[PDB]
């Protein structure tokens, strides 16, 4: 055997990105998982260089971000990459998870692959919250106030959890010095969950857009899917260039260029655009205990999808009723994001109430009724009885 399959470490490289048997049929949607390995390298590398010029005290926090942008050599290149790159991290991950429930890979034998992916999505939301509180702008103070006040609704436990989460009695100086130290660590826990995520893929491989088995026609990774990889990696860094150099402040709020003040309140407190559909679900339940339960049990409703699909065919390729309800779930996640950036008014409280019910009727009422009607309609359309 060759040296690349004889060495201890090179055979790990050879079994994953050189001679891994891939199906012959996969299209450009199987590339979004490769961009996320580049997206995570960019956000870690640009952040270690920006951590050399940062001060996490509450009286120095909104001056070390400006010292980076005005005094550090090419410091505006570092920040604008680490603020438009995290919004590029999320647009790929919304398209990664949406593919995997179209082709329906969550099924057997890939259920551990789907369960370690839900843990990554929880830890990714938590870093983008903890790092947006490190700028200490005006949106960065009243966003940490509203979220940490929810943990007082836990009965007999509440006001001893918030006072441990705050280090005081409000969003003080120990609140900002502990949020930076947790912002350095959870990106290193995500990287150890991606290594466990790739292990569960090596024992079963990828699926295909047909759904059926693909052990009859396979192609190695080298010279075909590496040169199919670089088509989208050069497209990724080209639209990551048209933002960092031409419109570097479109995906952001102007109120974050005012230093945070615990005495004047803004006219609107709205999140960054990728936490907006989860914001309208919290505001739709008129109780601060049943509102914090509902928003946490909306990322954890993905785990009931392996047990709720009643069909015998994998993937929504030849399913024409299970395809009409995939595109109702997509434009409902967009209407939920729009309402989380509105005012609490009429009718944006009844619209955010109906549309947070369609988020839950999909995984529990719409999937098992339609994936059972199709099993009978594939049967009585063929069997002559």
């Amino acid at each position: 055997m060759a040296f690349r399959k004889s060495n201890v470490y090179l055979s790990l490289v050879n079994s994953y990105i050189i001679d891994s048997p891939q199906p012959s049929s996969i299209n450009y949607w199987w590339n979004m998982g490769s961009l996320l390995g580049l997206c995570l390298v960019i956000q870690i590398v640009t952040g270690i260089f920006m951590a050399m010029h940062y001060s996490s005290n509450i009286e120095l926090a909104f001056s070390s971000v400006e010292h980076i942008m005005r005094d550090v050599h090419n410091g505006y290149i570092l920040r604008y990459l680490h603020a438009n790159g995290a919004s590029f991290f999320f647009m790929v991950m919304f398209m990664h998870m949406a593919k995997g429930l179209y082709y329906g890979s969550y099924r057997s034998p890939r259920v551990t692959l789907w369960n370690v992916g839900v843990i990554i999505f929880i830890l990714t939301i938590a870093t983008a919250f903890l790092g947006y509180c490190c700028v200490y702008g005006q949106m960065s103070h009243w966003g940490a106030t509203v979220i940490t006040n929810l943990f007082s609704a836990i009965p007999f436990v509440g006001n001893d959890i918030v006072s441990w989460l705050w280090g005081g009695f409000s969003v003080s100086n120990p609140t900002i010095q502990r949020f930076f130290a947790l912002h350095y660590l959870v990106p290193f826990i995500i990287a150890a969950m991606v290594i466990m995520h790739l292990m569960a893929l090596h024992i079963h491989g990828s699926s295909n857009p047909l759904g059926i088995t693909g052990n009859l026609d396979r192609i190695p990774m080298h010279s075909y899917f590496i040169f199919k990889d670089l088509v989208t990696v050069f497209l990724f860094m080209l639209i990551l260039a048209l933002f960092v150099f031409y419109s570097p402040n479109t995906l952001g709020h102007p109120d974050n260029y005012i230093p945070g003040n615990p005495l004047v309140t803004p006219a609107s407190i709205v999140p960054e655009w990728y936490l907006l559909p989860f914001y309208a679900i919290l505001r739709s339940i008129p109780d601060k205990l049943l509102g914090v339960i509902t928003m946490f049990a909306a990322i954890l409703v993905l785990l009931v999808l392996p047990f709720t699909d009643r069909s015998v065919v994998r993937g929504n390729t030849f399913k024409v009723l299970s395809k009409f309800f995939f595109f109702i779930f997509v434009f409902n996640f967009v209407l939920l994001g729009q309402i989380g950036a509105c005012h609490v008014e009429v009718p944006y409280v009844l619209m955010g109430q109906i549309a947070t019910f369609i988020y839950f009727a999909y995984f529990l009422i719409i999937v098992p009724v339609i994936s059972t009607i199709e099993n009978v309609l594939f049967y009585i359309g063929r069997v002559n009885k």
């Binding site: 010292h67 005005r70 005094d71 550090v72």
Partner: protein, 62 residues
């Protein structure tokens, strides 16, 4: 029919199959896509190591 009767490939085939025709134009393009990826990758590693130099308000106290 028999396995000694190959199907027709003349709808996709070249009309003058000189060997050096496709051996030159497939090394000019892979040559050009390893030249911009060598100058467009030395400039990125250099931007990240220029930031650790002396800051603009430190050069004013020189």
């Amino acid at each position: 029919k028999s396995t000694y009767r190959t199907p027709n490939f003349d709808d996709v085939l070249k009309e003058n199959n000189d060997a050096d025709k496709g051996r030159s134009y497939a090394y000019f393009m892979v040559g050009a896509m390893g030249l911009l990826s060598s100058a467009g990758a030395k400039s990125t590693v250099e931007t990240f190591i220029s930031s650790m130099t002396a800051t603009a308000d430190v050069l004013a106290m020189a």
